[PDB]
Amino acid sequence: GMSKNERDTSFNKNGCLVFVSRLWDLDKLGMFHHPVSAEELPDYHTVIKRPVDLSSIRDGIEKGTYATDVDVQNDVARMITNALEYNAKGSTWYQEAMSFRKTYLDLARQSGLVV
Ligand code: NA
Ligand code: NA
Secondary structure (H helix, E strand, O other): OOOHHHHOOOOOHHHHHHHHHHHHHHOOOOOOOOOOOOOOOOOOOOOOOOOOOHHHHHHHHHHOOOOOHHHHHHHHHHHHHHHHHHOOOOOHHHHHHHHHHHHHHHHHHHOOOOO
16 A cells, blocks of 8 residues: 555655756756855845745755645745746846746646645
């Protein structure tokens, strides 16, 4: 039968890793791959108090710090919203974030997550 971790389907570790891998590959610019560095954008954290990125999300999935698949999706939603709050409509970064907002739930679904 199922392991205790398998049988608790609130969080599905491997499905969540698939999801992050899909986002990683969708990210042509690599803009969401790693945390925003204050050295690169020193006015960013005045705006964004809850930064998050795909590497940090993957780490949390691996370490088992997410309670549910939806919590993983919440961090992706916030990642995207952060970009649309900080950036100026029309910029390369804004355009990529818009594309992510329209696509991420479909990728979560394809990857086997509860949506
Ligand atoms: Na089994
Ligand atoms: Na599980």
